[PDB]
Design a protein around this ligand. Structure first.
Ligand SMILES: [Zn+2]
Ligand SMILES: [Zn+2]
Ligand SMILES: [Zn+2]
Ligand SMILES: [Zn+2]
Length: 53
């Protein structure tokens, strides 16, 4: 059915899957350059956008 997806309900690098897709990573903020997400993302692995980690 589904795939490993960010809990916000969207493929993101923070959820590796057999397809490893994360969507177009908007390089417009301090994210892993693999976080395409935007909308309602309570995933801790995506909130992380502070300090070099
Ligand atoms: Zn996938
Ligand atoms: Zn994300
Ligand atoms: Zn997300
Ligand atoms: Zn996430």
């Amino acid at each position: 059915g589904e795939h490993t997806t960010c809990g916000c309900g969207e493929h993101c690098g923070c959820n590796p899957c057999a397809c490893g897709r994360e969507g177009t990573p908007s390089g417009r903020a301090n994210r892993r350059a693999n976080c395409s997400c935007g909308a309602a993302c309570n995933c801790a692995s995506c909130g992380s956008a502070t300090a070099p980690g």
